[PDB]
Copies of this chain bind each other. A is one copy, B any other.
């Protein structure tokens, strides 16, 4: 006889999780703000972590890890990669990024790196993004910095991946989204199914104003791409179609060419923040579903772009992903092959 609260109605993932908990006897949905719960499906911002686990009779579990924002925010992820001992010297899968503040700034270091590639004749395209809206792709540091100063928000100048892996037919850009569930005991689980947020326009290296070929954001493609849904429904390619394209056109499997790097990046990222977010020494337990965003270059190298704390699932994967959250993260604490447990070699 377990009880749960829902403090985020906008979360599509946990709305399905709530329905899965109901219609299976064991769970009763308590009113919002009712503190006598077992599971809390909390809000995205300002979650009351301090009030959790202070009833010495019931076991409390929350769908978020306190402090995950030091990995899921654009500027804090850049800070983590460059300053964590586990990542600062070993990270070869994160594009060269610098935190910029408009009118802890790394503005001077960006200009030094921009001038170094310029003098050597190296690729100098950079992308600026706020912590799809307010994104500028340019090969001019003067143009990029001025863009930041206009908006009143912290931006991050990341090195633009000028040579991405282009899907054929169409010759189009894409990004990979992977769903990772970390349970109460910090066991990292990669959901078997991923999604490719593809572009429906052919990719070209010259015109950066054409956002339909340069930005693979789902909202950018539905609102501006004239060929939206031309190659695949809702510009979303799944791992079966992507593995078939890879094994055919490039003669290599998705598991070896891309998924091994993905699994390595996920484990390195979550374990760098593990000591700062572990609920071992806290009165309550935590679990979180993450959305890892990757970009593959033409040499088949995976690059981490962003990490999402509150991700949204693909329509067909909602049933399996939400059932996996119920079984692995909820039923492990409160008991009545689709998730790979990511582990170290030794």
- Decide if A82 touches B346 in the complex (CB within 8 Å): yes
Can you list 22 contacts pairing A with B, beta carbon distance less than 8 Å? A82-B346, A85-B85, A85-B86, A86-B86, A86-B89, A86-B90, A87-B90, A88-B344, A89-B267, A89-B268, A89-B271, A89-B344, A90-B90, A90-B91, A90-B268, A92-B264, A96-B345, A96-B346, A98-B346, A106-B346, A109-B346, A113-B346
> Which A44-87 residues have C-beta < 8 A from chain B?
82, 85-87
A253-288: contact bitstring with B at CB < 8 Å (1 yes, 0 no)?
000000000001001100100000000000000000
How many copies of the chain does the oligomer comprise?
A: 2
Majority secondary structure, A binding face: loop
Interface residues on A, range: 20 to 34
A264 to B91, CA, bound (A): 10
Task: Tell me the A residues contacting B by CB distance below 8 Å.
Answer: 82, 85-92, 96, 98, 106, 109, 113, 264, 267-268, 271, 344-346
Q: Closest approach, in angstroms, between the C-beta of A161 and any C-beta of chain B?
A: 16
Residues of B within 8 A of A345 (CB): 96
Q: Closest approach, in angstroms, between the C-beta of A207 and any C-beta of chain B?
A: 29
A344 to B92, CA, bound (A): 10
Nearest residue (CB) in B for A83 is: B346
